[PDB]
Specification:
This is part of a larger assembly, with 9 protein chains of 9 kinds. With about 160 residues, chain B is α/β, with parallel strands linked by helices. Chain B has helices at about 5-10, 130-135, 150-160; strands spanning about 10-15, 20-25, 45, 65-70, 90-95, 115-120, 145, 145-150. Chain B has an 8-stranded mixed sheet, with no helix packed on it. Chain B has one domain (about 1-160): Leucine-rich repeat, LRR (right-handed beta-alpha superhelix), CATH 3.80.10. Chain E is built from 5 helices and 4 strands, in the order αββαααββα. With about 80 residues, chain G is mainly beta. Chain G has a single domain (about 1-85), classed as SH3 type barrels. In chain G, strands 1, 2, 3, 4, 5 and 6 form a 6-stranded antiparallel sheet that branches. Chain G starts with a helix and ends in a 12-residue tail after the last strand. The chains are: A alpha+beta (about 80), B alpha/beta (about 160), C alpha+beta (about 170), D mainly beta (about 70), E alpha+beta (about 120), F mainly beta (about 80), G mainly beta (about 80), H alpha+beta (about 100), I mainly beta (about 80). The interface of A and D includes residues 8, 9, 24, 25 and 75 of A. Strand 5 (about 65-70) of chain F pairs antiparallel with strand 7 of chain H. Chain G binds one RNA strand of 88 nucleotides through strand 2. The PDB classes it as splicing.
Chain lengths: ~80, ~160, ~170, ~70, ~120, ~80, ~80, ~100, ~80
RNA sequence: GGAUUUUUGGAGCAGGGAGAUGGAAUAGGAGCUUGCUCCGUCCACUCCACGCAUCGACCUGGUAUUGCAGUACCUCCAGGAACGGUGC
């Protein structure tokens, strides 16, 4: 009936926007990855730009630049800009 | 008649009524309490329905036991080393038995795990202050003659017979 | 009669699992424990059934525990009207059944007459209605179940009683 | 090689438990045979009662071990 | 070479072995899963002992009617219908031979004597 | 090639397996398949802070194992 | 190839079962739609989240990747898988 | 098979696992870094794609808190390792 | 080989992802080897959080459990076949 | 056939502070055994912030139901926390 909006479609529209989002992680919901994705592949192993670790409890942000986070330790993201 | 590990391994070790591991040996009149630990740590209930066991004795080291049927037996007394061989024991149902005098209640109190007990149909039943002796000697008990124990009964049973 | 025995008339402030443990301890003696069908919903509260190995076992737990004290009120046990799902998936020798139904099913009549050590056969007098003659391959069995059936209920609209056939 | 059966649940509301004990409350919107159920109007629910609307969450089945229903669909 | 015996206890030559067709084995379930080489050998076995025993312990006589039925569930259903037919064609006076009481209504031999000697007829 | 096939050179072989739940056991395993599946036997096993628990026929998993120790009379190049 | 485990899951789907997940998320209810990848859809379930407030929800999507176990029909003990 | 194992040697040798490739062609004693914090030091005798390496002169050490953690240390010469419990396989430690 | 295929149908203590022991009368295997344990129970450590309180295990029974493939740490025999 | 659902793993780890409070017989170091001083692993009592809430089972007495059906688990009030894991 209704057609599929792929998660790769989400990531592709985000990258085309070159937008800044914060992403969730595994077994630790305290930390978020705040940055923009540069490109992609068929694998959804998230590559990132100007990213930083942002802690909930600690309240700090440690920046990496164009970082390549793991693909399996992704959960989702919120587009903040 | 020889009661062997034949009749203990061929015994039924499977889901009981309250969904526990029970091992029935009904229909033997087995008077010999031997060769039992070959339940192999996968059993909690040992049942000897239709037995003539000269008294209450003869079990192996079962740190797991959770029910035992020694009813319709020839229980006259009560043996000593019951607790270290049944620390997980709450159900030692010895009704239709032939315990007589409160000297058959000497090892009854040394267990810390007794709550669900039955010694029904014994001449220790209609004797005066018999349930009083029971409610004195059994601290952690909760199921006695299939009706709850009472704090009033415990007060009576501690206070009397000083 | 039934191997599924009704056990009820106890308290409700008692738990289903706890009363099940009590019933197991007090039922492995008079019969075998196959399964305790216990429902504590309101439509059937304070009651359960134990499915014993033998129908005479269940009715004998009923006739010995005919009001045995337990759990807030002397519990009453009888046979059931039918049998449980486990067992569902599984003085003389001859005696005239008076108040013998012109309606009874010969199957249930046979399970009644063979409650005892196996009966020989039941012969529901097919002339002038309301009579039967049943013989048992064990005369002690016949007399036992016929005396315990003096005034027995089957299809409770009547009492089906069997006495020693005359000379 | 078989797509998942979110078919009558699509375009409907689910409250999901993903790893980190987190919850994503949202609409079933998009997926793959990888079960990557993507929730728009999806909001996070933390350990504390704090909740932020995330816009459009493409929440991978990499972690989300639960999700309950808001309606019958 | 598995070559079967002759009277003088040697191999049997090959064209002769082929003629006798020993290669073919017959799963006789009645005989303790015995299995036979040689076809007429197989057949005579049905009256040989091992088959006789098999039958006795099966609970069904070694009458011809089952010979060449080797599976035991087939045997029991066969002998089942056979039993039914033997009981049918038997004339049993108990259920057939029938007696009117004096009262103008009829019963069988059995019930007639039953109520006769238990004090009415 | 893989060293899964090197561990396939183990039957009637005295080995020692340190498994995933802090386990360390001595074992003559029963038989090992291509996915490391090596079922233990007469094995004395001790997980994290444990006892010498005995298993006469036990089935030690694959990816839920950590380290394996082969016999001492075991030629390595001949085993891989 | 095809798993008699999956045949067991198919005989356990549709009615009251009780799945038990990784962190203690255990859902006892109608395990309606389970696909051989085990992403079990439960219906009218009572799930504990190991929290001891084992509360009743409806039509949950409990993945089987975290599923520690799954209590199935106690009536199919005579399965065609084992027999 | 044949061309596949050719490319396989080329992959283990001129790829990321060059550390273990040199541990095998050079007979180096290399630090296999566990994901579970148990440091085993020793050679590499059998090695392949998934980081499955068999180590000789194996010595396992842990930070064991009885306090201030001590280096629990033992040395089983021959012992195998699968690549799942491994986080790294480093050619050269300073010891 | 199918090693367990001889030891099935008996009450076998299967080990967990979290260190329990569950004696189910095991049935069958797979390529993922997901367990179908019939007449199956479980028991795990009732941690006292202390030493003057001692450690036990509270009894849990699932009956027949379809333990997903990610479970087994081991499979040993704790009950002969009934 | 080691990449988002099962078998090449996110596994490991550590229990919140203190009082001239205390036990280590056979087991810790130095002051070179005994005596005594200080020092890096727990539990019992007590102070905080009974480490904090939920719920479940139970012990206590009162309290509603007499009833036939195959159970995650079925009363209500009130106390206590003997026990379990969920958020910090």
């Amino acid at each position: 009936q209704k057609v599929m909006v792929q998660p790769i479609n989400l990531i592709f529209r985000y990258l085309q926007n070159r937008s800044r989002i914060q992403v969730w992680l595994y077994e630790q919901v305290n930390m978020r990855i705040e940055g923009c994705i540069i490109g992609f592949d068929e694998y959804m192993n998230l590559v990132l730009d100007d990213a930083e670790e942002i802690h909930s409890k600690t309240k700090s942000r440690k920046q990496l630049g164009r970082i390549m986070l793991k693909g399996d330790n992704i959960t989702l993201l919120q587009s903040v800009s | 008649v020889k009661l062997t590990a034949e009749l203990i391994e061929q015994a039924a070790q499977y889901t009981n009524a309250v969904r526990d591991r029970e091992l029935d040996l009904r229909g033997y009149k087995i008077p010999v309490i031997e060769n039992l630990g070959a339940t192999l740590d996968q059993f909690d209930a040992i049942d000897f329905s239709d037995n003539e066991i000269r008294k209450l004795d003869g079990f192996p080291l079962l740190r797991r036991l959770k029910t035992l049927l020694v009813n319709n037996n020839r229980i006259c007394r009560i043996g000593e080393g019951l607790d270290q061989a049944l620390p997980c024991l709450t159900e030692l149902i010895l009704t239709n038995n032939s315990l007589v005098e409160l000297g058959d209640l000497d090892p009854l109190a040394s267990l810390k795990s007794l709550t669900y007990l039955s010694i029904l149909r014994n001449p220790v039943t209609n004797k005066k202050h018999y349930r009083l002796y029971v409610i004195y000697k059994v601290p952690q008990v909760r199921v006695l003659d299939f009706q709850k124990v009472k704090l009033k009964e415990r007060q009576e049973a501690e206070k009397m017979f000083k | 009669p039934n191997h599924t025995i009704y056990i009820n008339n106890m308290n409700d402030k008692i738990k289903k699992e706890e009363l099940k443990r009590s019933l197991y301890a007090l039922f492995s003696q008079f019969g075998h424990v196959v399964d305790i069908v216990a429902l504590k919903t309101m439509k059937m509260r304070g009651q359960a059934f134990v499915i014993f190995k033998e129908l005479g076992s269940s009715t004998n737990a009923l006739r010995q525990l005919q009001g045995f004290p337990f759990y807030g009120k002397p519990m009453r046990i009888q046979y059931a009207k039918t049998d449980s799902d486990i067992i569902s998936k599984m003085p003389n020798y001859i005696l005239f059944l008076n108040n013998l139904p012109e309606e009874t099913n010969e199957m249930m009549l046979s399970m009644l007459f063979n409650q005892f050590p196996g009966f020989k056969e039941v012969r529901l007098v097919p002339g002038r209605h309301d009579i039967a003659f049943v013989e048992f391959e064990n005369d002690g069995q016949a007399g036992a179940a016929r005396d315990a059936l003096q005034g027995f209920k089957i299809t409770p609209s009547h009492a089906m009683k069997i006495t020693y056939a005359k000379k | 090689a078989h797509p998942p059966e979110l078919k009558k649940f699509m375009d409907k509301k689910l409250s999901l438990k993903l790893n980190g004990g987190r919850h994503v409350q949202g609409i079933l919107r998009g997926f793959d045979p990888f079960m990557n159920l993507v929730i728009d109007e999806c909001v996070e629910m933390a350990t504390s009662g704090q909740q932020n609307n995330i816009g459009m969450v493409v929440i991978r089945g990499n972690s989300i071990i639960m999700l309950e229903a808001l309606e019958r669909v | 070479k598995n070559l079967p015996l002759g009277w003088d206890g040697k191999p049997i030559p090959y064209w002769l072995y082929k003629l006798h067709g020993l290669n073919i084995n017959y799963n006789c379930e009645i005989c303790g899963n015995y299995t036979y080489r040689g076809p007429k050998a197989f057949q005579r076995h049905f009256a040989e002992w091992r088959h006789a025993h098999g039958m006795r312990c099966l609970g069904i006589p070694n009458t011809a009617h089952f010979a060449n039925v080797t599976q035991i569930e087939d045997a029991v259903s066969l002998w089942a219908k056979l039993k039914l037919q033997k009981a049918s064609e038997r004339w049993q006076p108990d259920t057939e031979e029938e007696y009117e009481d004096s009262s103008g209504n009829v019963v069988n031999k059995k019930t007639y004597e039953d109520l006769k000697r238990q004090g009415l007829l | 090639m893989k060293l899964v096939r090197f561990l396939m050179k183990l039957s009637h072989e005295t080995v020692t397996i340190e498994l995933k739940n802090g386990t360390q056991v001595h074992g003559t395993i029963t038989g090992v398949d291509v996915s490391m599946n090596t079922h233990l036997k007469a094995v004395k096993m001790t997980l994290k802070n444990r006892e010498p628990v005995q298993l006469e026929t036990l089935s030690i998993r694959g990816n839920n194992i950590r380290y394996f120790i082969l016999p001492d009379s075991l030629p390595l190049d001949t085993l891989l | 190839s095809i798993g008699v485990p999956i045949k067991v899951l198919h005989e356990a789907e549709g009615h009251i079962v009780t799945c038990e997940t990784n962190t203690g998320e255990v859902y006892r209810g109608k395990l309606i739609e389970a696909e051989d990848n085990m992403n079990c859809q439960m219906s009218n379930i009572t799930v504990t989240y190991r929290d001891g407030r084992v509360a009743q929800l409806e039509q949950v999507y409990i993945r089987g990747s975290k599923i520690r176990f799954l209590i199935l029909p106690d009536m199919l003990k005579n399965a065609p898988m084992l027999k | 098979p044949e061309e596949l194992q050719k490319r396989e040697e080329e992959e283990f040798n001129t790829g990321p696992l060059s550390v273990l490739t040199q541990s095998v062609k050079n007979n180096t004693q290399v630090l296999i870094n566990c994901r579970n914090n148990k440091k085993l030091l020793g050679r590499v005798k059998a090695f392949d794609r998934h980081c499955n390496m068999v180590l000789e002169n194996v010595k396992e050490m842990w930070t064991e808190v009885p306090s201030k953690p001590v280096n629990k240390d033992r040395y089983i010469s021959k012992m195998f390792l699968r690549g799942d419990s491994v986080i790294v396989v480093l050619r050269n430690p300073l010891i | 080989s199918s090693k367990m295929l001889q030891h099935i149908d008996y009450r076998m203590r299967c080990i967990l992802q979290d260190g329990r022991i569950f004696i189910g009368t095991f049935k069958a295997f797979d390529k993922h080897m997901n367990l179908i344990l019939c007449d199956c129970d479980e028991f795990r450590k009732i941690k006292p959080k202390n030493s003057k309180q001692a450690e036990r295990e509270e009894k849990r029974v699932l009956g027949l459990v379809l333990l997903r493939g990610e479970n087994l740490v081991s499979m040993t025999v704790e009950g002969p076949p009934p």
